[PDB]
A = this chain, B = another copy of it.
Amino acid sequence: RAMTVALAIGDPNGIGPEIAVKAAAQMQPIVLFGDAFVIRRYARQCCLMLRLVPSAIDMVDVASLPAEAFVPGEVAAAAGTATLAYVSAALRAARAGQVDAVIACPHSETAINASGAGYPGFVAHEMGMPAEDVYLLLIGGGLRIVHATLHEGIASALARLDQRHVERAARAAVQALQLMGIAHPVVGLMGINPHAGEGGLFGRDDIDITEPVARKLRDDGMTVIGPQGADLLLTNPDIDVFVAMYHDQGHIPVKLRAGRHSAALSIGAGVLFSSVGHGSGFDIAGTLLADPAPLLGAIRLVTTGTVLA
């Protein structure tokens, strides 16, 4: 099949629009979201048709930036407010079944400050849910791990965990992988306790949370391995995606394997989301000097669930 991927062009005065058009020109999934006048500046410079666009380079005009403000590259309140307008519109499109994945192109933290930014939670807000219901899916070195809990003290995460998060984390990951072309993803649930509690010997958290969720998912047809001690489970190459119960459980193995050749998307909000930004290339903006590679990386991540090494 083909996913449709929205690229929100990022800071209009930055490098985003340039790499967004560059990525789209090269190009099994692409619909740009941004001020059409901003995108056109860059397209003419290196190109094909551009159609304002239901379905059928394609772009959706999201009107934000005063023309007066378009100068590559400084930024202003308006260009910071625009970056988020584009993301907002791309997420609205996802809500309307139009778009499968949203990629946020590089932005400027100083411009967003100027306007009156942090995506996973901005995404959560827009989508009508708390931050805790969006889950980080970390990919690299042939591993894909969604995290039921993330940035907090491990004594706090253990307390947050319940059947709801583990079930929502697993279903979101299956659906993501299905969109990615993995028809029947094998899910691996990591044990909360070592050895997934060893028949109650190490406590009853797995008996309470991951065992009942495992049974429920299997009854809805999914193939689910576990819960099993994470140290055994991750040795199994037959698993397509793993549910880690806390930050370190999934961050250690991906980073050990892949190091820097890894990347993240957020799932659970009813869209595959990722961000590209290592800042807006302001001092090279306009010049067409931007390389699209990091962005083609994110497209690859959301459509394939792999990271090249």
Contacts and interface: CB of A to CB of B under 8 A. Distances in A.
A194 B249 CA distance: 10
Interface residues of A, number: 35
Interface stretch (A48-56, A152-160, A300-308): A152-160
Interface string A230-241: 111011000000
A197 B153 contact: yes
B251 A248 contact: no
Q: Which label, helix, strand, loop or mixed, suits the secondary structure of the A interface?
A: helix
Contacts of A205: 153, 155
B154 A193 contact: yes
A97 interface: no
B235 A256 contact: yes
B235 A251 contact: no
A130 interface: no
A51 B259 CA distance: 53
A254 B202 CA distance: 21
Most buried by B among A231, A235, A252: A252
A95 interface: no
A270 interface: no
Nearest to A254: B231
B202 A151 contact: yes
Contacts of A44: none
A235 B249 contact: no
Nearest to A250: B231
A212 B156 CA distance: 22
A250 to B, nearest CB: 9
B255 A256 contact: no
Contacts of A41: none
29 contacts: A151-B194, A151-B202, A152-B194, A152-B202, A153-B193, A154-B158, A154-B192, A154-B202, A155-B155, A155-B158, A155-B205, A194-B251, A229-B248, A230-B248, A231-B247, A231-B254, A231-B255, A232-B255, A234-B252, A234-B255, A235-B255, A235-B256, A235-B259, A248-B248, A252-B253, A252-B256, A253-B253, A253-B256, A256-B256
Given A153-B197, A154-B193, 13 more contacts: A151-B202, A152-B203, A153-B193, A153-B202, A153-B205, A154-B158, A154-B192, A154-B202, A156-B203, A229-B248, A249-B252, A253-B256, A256-B257
